[PDB]
Design a binder for this molecule. Structure first.
Ligand SMILES: [Mg+2]
Ligand SMILES: [Mg+2]
Ligand SMILES: [Mg+2]
Ligand SMILES: [Zn+2]
Lengths: 563, 38, 131, 141
RNA sequence: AGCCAGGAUGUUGGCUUAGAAGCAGCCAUCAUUUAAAGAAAGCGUAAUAGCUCACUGGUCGAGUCGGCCUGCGCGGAAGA
């Protein structure tokens, strides 16, 4: 399109497709005139010019005489075209190589065939805004594009697979089978599932089986559509696209079919959210109302996810893009209305001793005469290293002086867990820290556990300060692909961020960059990437091992509560 | 440009030219090194 | 430091090394590569000898003043960055061979490697005996 | 068929062949993969530096293959494993910067005079002597 | 002044050792290899390439280069 805009080139664009996407394209219509003077197009079959008419909005047109402004390239590309569609069989070629031109009809049927195998792509040119070219493309949609039965059948999985589990001839006779391409949200019924019947007939009220979800669904109000507008239809034949109200379980891409139909259709693959942000209703307690909305819209987009990570109280919204996540937020303000401001995700820090070791201890005078028992422990701190064990809660039991009561000798590390479990440094949990009770004191009458754990608690507290632990933030193994021209800038940006790198690697269609970057960092990395790479790069985060960082925030977020 | 009352050579490729009496610095390396009046 | 007095001295200090030994060489300044001419003058210093002066102070007038006492052909202007490479055990040794074989490859160019001949009349190489 | 046109020094010297992971993705321009990553260095990376510094060139030529007359036992490893003291620059003015002696010089002279040569076998020997002596401290022998 | 061009392959440095790159931090380390090798010049400096710190050889026919003192000038310098 846009052949009515300067810089317009039919020829150049064709090459662009061949040079960049990879497709080999066969011209169908060359162009009559330049961008301002786009009169119309030249068919390489009819050998005519459909100069369209300006007064009517393209409604009328005239097939013309193929003027000499363009009567010579036409011959070249018509000749190049025959050759390619004639490249469908020697029966055409034997006559083609017979020096004789095969009939256009054999070319057009040959054309439809070559498109089916994707051997060739047919290029049509027009200007919709200039109300020209559009009617012919709609004609060529008829000429080469595939009808439902102009290609082979939908295939399937049956009972964990079969020789030909499904070879469903798309027919008004075969058993009902479909796919829900889309689930959309309608506020009055609560859903609208778009389905294409691959093979079958379904009617109002017909039950269907969710092959993927192993369930029963009744199709209440099958409707056809004109975008937003909907027209109810009693039944849908195969090869028809329709929207189904009354369906409540079908995931985008889940097959809806009559019983004994294919369990799995090929559309089980979807992209991964690339941007993450967090959200808050103005009213702190509209959080469920907000929460439900995020969920509904999450059903509609398998690419918008809402997980409220329980590490922090924050509601986290993940999406494929900054617009999406904003288009996904104004929908909440507009439908399922809630007013909400987005922000930053929280910080999943941790801590660990560096190396320091002592024989630290804790003690309370639980006796006082009347109380009757006491508990006291001498402990011994060590770290392991950042990432040597799967069991971060490492430990060694030693005690042979003041050997606390036996029935809970081994039961005196799990009660201590509740310090390694969360928060000793700035409200963040501990990894790899090793505790070692060696001495202590007790008396084996009833050495009270709940008031003996105060010894353990002050043991952790005092032990922590002496041992000088550290704080290690989350840092992952990012992997990026990009064109081999933006390497300098993408790595410069990673360098601005606190990112180390991994792989001196260059792909063949690009370059695979590997980088270790923080997790609190890279907020909105995707959009920065697109900006500096011309929206032609992908990436991933692998949640790699945590690493330490000098941070003015780790202490200001606990000095927020001061002492 | 810069109308500093004291133009100087900020780089190595700066030149001092005296078009119209006005003493100017013109640098064909960095255009931020373009000054007007000595 | 190629001043006038240093020239008046090094003219004879470079005539002497080629007037007591074998023919010397000369290598132009067109294109030395990170490997080819660098490591080639390396192997030149290695095999040819640790006395060759690959430097060039070969001005036309300095040559006519210093070198032309004997072998006056040096005086004629030479457009070369001479890589003066003599030879120890007789005339036309490995250094001369390497220069003559480098004038066509394995270097930028060796300026045809005319060299110094006491006779100064032999277009042919010194293999006059049939042997 | 060209001299290395990919000088990107992000390779741990010796150790693992093609040690990209520690080295950083900041030298990504070169197009080496699992085809050229175990062809020649994997099979001739033993008798030069086995756990020492032997800086690898970035040679990737257009013979549709990777091969060249590789250098000698690197003096960087010769003077750092023939030393005992594995130090060097950085802390050369305070304490031992590594060991370098006439025995190590003779070793490197008789060892790395094969392909990493200069204006003499003895001249590349003086090269290794410089790579051993300019560490900042040398053993006296 | 104007013109024919040449800087490592011990050298991610033996390096704050995950290099920070034959010209990031960095110590210093001609490092013969020289019409040349600095482990640092603007380019990518975190990295190639193709112009290239530095340096010189080749050209080319009379002056050239910077300072210091001094005279007289120039800008700084816009009001009813
Ligand atoms: Mg004044
Ligand atoms: Mg004035
Ligand atoms: Mg003014
Ligand atoms: Zn300037």
């Amino acid at each position: 399109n846009k052949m009515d805009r300067m810089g317009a080139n039919f020829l150049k664009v064709v090459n662009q497709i061949k040079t960049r996407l990879g497709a080999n394209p066969v011209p169908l219509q060359l162009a009559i005139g330049a961008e301002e003077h786009f009169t119309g197009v030249v068919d390489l079959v009819k050998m005519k010019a459909i100069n369209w008419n300006d007064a009517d909005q393209g409604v009328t047109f005239e097939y013309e005489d193929i003027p000499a402004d363009m009567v010579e390239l036409a011959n070249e590309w018509h000749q190049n075209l025959i050759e390619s569609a004639a490249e469908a069989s020697e029966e055409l070629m034997e006559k083609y190589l017979g020096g004789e031109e095969l009939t256009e009809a054999e070319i057009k049927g040959a054309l439809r065939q070559r498109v089916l195998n994707n051997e060739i792509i047919l290029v049509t040119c027009g200007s919709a805004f200039k109300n020209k070219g559009v009617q012919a493309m709609l004609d060529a949609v008829i000429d080469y594009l595939p009808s439902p039965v102009d290609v082979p059948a939908i295939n399937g999985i049956l009972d964990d697979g079969k020789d030909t589990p499904a070879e469903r001839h798309a027919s008004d006779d075969e058993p009902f089978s479909a796919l829900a391409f889309k689930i959309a949200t309608d506020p009055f019924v609560g859903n609208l599932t778009f389905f294409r019947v691959y093979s079958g007939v379904v009617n109002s009220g017909d039950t269907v089986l969710n092959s993927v979800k192993a369930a029963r669904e009744r199709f209440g109000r099958i409707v056809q559509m004109h975008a937003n507008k909907r027209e109810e239809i009693k039944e849908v034949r195969a090869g028809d696209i329709a929207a189904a109200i009354g369906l409540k379980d079908v995931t985008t891409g889940d097959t809806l079919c009559d019983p004994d139909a294919p369990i799995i259709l090929e559309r089980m693959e979807f992209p991964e959210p690339v941007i993450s942000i967090a959200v808050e209703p103005k009213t702190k307690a509209d959080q469920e109302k907000m929460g439900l909305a995020l969920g509904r819209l999450a059903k509609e987009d398998p690419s918008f996810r809402v997980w409220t990570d329980e590490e922090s109280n924050q509601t986290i919204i993940a999406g494929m893009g900054e617009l999406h996540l904003d288009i996904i937020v104004d929908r909440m303000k507009r439908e399922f209305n809630v007013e909400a401001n987005v922000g930053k995700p929280q910080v999943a820090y941790r801590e660990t001793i560096r190396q320091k070791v002592t024989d630290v201890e804790g003690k309370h005078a639980k006796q006082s005469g009347g109380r009757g028992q006491y508990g006291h422990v001498v402990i011994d701190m060590y770290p392991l290293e950042p990432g040597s064990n799967p069991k971060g809660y490492e430990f060694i039991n030693d005690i042979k002086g003041g050997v606390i009561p036996g029935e809970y000798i081994p039961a005196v590390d799990k009660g201590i867990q509740e310090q390694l479990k969360a928060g000793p440094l700035a409200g963040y949990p501990v990894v790899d820290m090793g505790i070692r009770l060696h001495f202590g004191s007790y008396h084996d009458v009833d050495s009270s556990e709940l008031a003996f754990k105060l010894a353990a608690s002050i043991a952790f507290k005092e032990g922590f300060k002496k041992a000088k632990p550290v704080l290690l933030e989350p840092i992952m193994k990012v992997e990026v692909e990009t064109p081999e021209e933006n390497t300098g800038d993408v790595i410069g940006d990673l360098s601005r961020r606190r990112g180390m790198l991994k792989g001196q690697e260059s792909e063949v269609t690009g370059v695979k960059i590997h980088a270790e970057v923080p997790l609190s960092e890279m907020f909105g990395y995707a959009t920065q990437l697109r900006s500096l790479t011309k929206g032609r790069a992908s990436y991933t985060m692998e949640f790699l091992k945590y690493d330490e960082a000098p941070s003015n925030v780790a202490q200001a977020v606990i000095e927020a509560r001061g002492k | 440009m810069k109308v500093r009352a004291s133009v100087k050579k900020l780089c190595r490729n700066c030149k001092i030219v005296k078009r119209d009496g006005v003493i100017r610095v013109i640098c064909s390396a960095e255009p931020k090194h373009k000054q007007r009046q000595g | 430091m190629a001043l006038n007095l240093q020239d008046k001295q090094a003219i004879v200090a470079e005539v002497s090394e080629v007037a007591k030994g074998a023919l010397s060489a000369v290598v132009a300044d067109s294109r030395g590569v990170t490997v080819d001419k660098m490591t080639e003058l390396r192997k030149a210093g290695r095999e040819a000898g640790v006395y060759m002066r690959v430097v060039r102070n070969t001005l036309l007038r300095r040559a006519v003043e210093g070198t032309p006492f004997e072998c006056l052909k040096d005086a004629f202007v030479g457009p070369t960055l001479i890589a003066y490479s003599m030879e120890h055990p007789g005339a036309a040794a490995r250094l001369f061979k390497e220069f003559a074989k480098a004038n066509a490859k394995f270097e930028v160019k060796a300026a045809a490697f005319e060299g110094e001949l006491i006779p100064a009349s032999q277009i042919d190489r010194l293999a006059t005996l049939p042997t | 068929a060209k001299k290395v046109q990919a000088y990107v020094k992000l390779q741990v010297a010796a150790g693992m062949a093609n040690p990209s992971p520690p080295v950083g993705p900041a030298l990504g321009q070169q197009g080496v993969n699992i085809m050229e990553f175990c062809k020649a260095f994997n099979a001739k990376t033993d008798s030069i530096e086995k756990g020492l510094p032997i800086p690898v060139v970035i040679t990737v030529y257009a013979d549709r293959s990777f091969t060249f007359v590789t250098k000698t036992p690197p003096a960087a490893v010769l003077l750092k494993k023939a030393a005992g003291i594995k130090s060097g620059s950085g802390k050369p003015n305070k304490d031992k910067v590594g060991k370098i002696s006439r025995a190590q010089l003779q070793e490197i002279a008789q060892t790395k005079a094969a392909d990493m040569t200069g204006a003499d076998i003895e001249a590349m020997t003086r090269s290794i002597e410089g790579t051993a002596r300019s560490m900042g401290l040398v053993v006296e022998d």
